[PDB]
């Protein structure tokens, strides 16, 4: 029941292209440099050199919209500073209700495929349907911006494009606020917490939020804008949005420890402290908890004790829904 952004009708356009024997080309967000950017990604820029617009059906013999469900590992940041957005999309996948709204089902590259897709966002004070053609920025046959751990999966790349479309261009997405993305996917209420002055029952607040299906994100502030994308010695990225994906407690050497799980939208580069994938701490806990919580995989997701979490991170944003 969403309203058509710019008046473009997904079903009518798809049927029309199928009848006319052609693939959709978006006049509202065309496959040209103006859709990429205006400065760092403008036509006269080095970052756009070699960038060509290609459809998934031109790159692979078997492109798929969704493979093994739409999940957080499907969100791997590319050469665009839109971590705030990607962390939001990753969190979104943990609430099927909202995911199913933002990403309509029944879309594929097989039957009825006409080079057009659509998504719904909370914009201009309402739920709007945004259409996009599947021409994506590529370099040497690979996606330049967001991509999935599954090489033949494209829903996340297409959603990022629709979000870029409503904002004017991909470059417009460089630099942002996680809460802004949370609201565009939920129309809900956002709150934030200063981890340097965190409430005594903040962990409980997180537990309930995660249970209700709220979206949570966190980040580490920097002294200035020069320490951009600076990795700490503990291997955390500062000035970078992370998705908070879980909160569980474990019994460590006789007493339970509050743990928190988060994911770097890069899909790699994880924390190297206690509770990390190859950390020793997992030996001092019971097998059940270890096998049920620990996952040894370079996926950008990792656990931290809540104690270390509030010391290392500076901000936590939470978006609660209906
Ligand atoms: C994220 C990345 O891709 O690594 C990138 O650093 C980013 O978006 N940085 C943000 C902060 C994180 C989301 C904590 C940033 O530096 N924002 C300040 C941008 C100021 C304009 N902001 C908004 N929110 N419209
Ligand atoms: Ca997937
Ligand atoms: Ca991991």
UniProtKB/Swiss-Prot annotation:
Calpain catalytic domain boundaries: 23-322
UniProt record, GO biological process: cellular response to hydrogen peroxide; mammary gland involution; negative regulation of actin filament polymerization; negative regulation of non-canonical NF-kappaB signal transduction; positive regulation of cardiac muscle cell apoptotic process; positive regulation of leukocyte tethering or rolling; positive regulation of vascular permeability; protein autoprocessing
Post-translational modifications reported in the UniProt record: Undergoes calcium-induced successive autoproteolytic cleavages that generate a membrane-bound 78 kDa active form and an intracellular 75 kDa active form. Calpastatin reduces with high efficiency the transition from 78 kDa to 75 kDa calpain forms.
Active site: 83, 240, 264
Signal peptide boundaries: none
Positions bearing Phosphothreonine: 322
Keywords in alphabetical order: Autocatalytic cleavage, Calcium, Cell membrane, Cytoplasm, Hydrolase, Membrane, Metal-binding, Phosphoprotein, Protease, Repeat, Thiol protease
Example GO molecular function: calcium ion binding
Entry's Gene Ontology cellular component terms: cornified envelope; cytoplasm; cytosol; glutamatergic synapse; lysosome; membrane; mitochondrion; plasma membrane
Subcellular localization(s) per the UniProt record: Cytoplasm; Cell membrane
Function of the protein: Calcium-regulated non-lysosomal thiol-protease which catalyzes limited proteolysis of substrates involved in cytoskeletal remodeling and signal transduction. Proteolytically cleaves CTBP1 at 'Asn-364', 'Gly-377' and 'His-399'. Cleaves and activates caspase-7 (CASP7).
Family statement: Belongs to the peptidase C2 family.
Subunit and partners: Forms a heterodimer with a small (regulatory) subunit CAPNS1.
Listed name of the protein: Calpain-1 catalytic subunit
Gene for this chain: Capn1
Residues of the full protein shown: 33 to 354 of 713
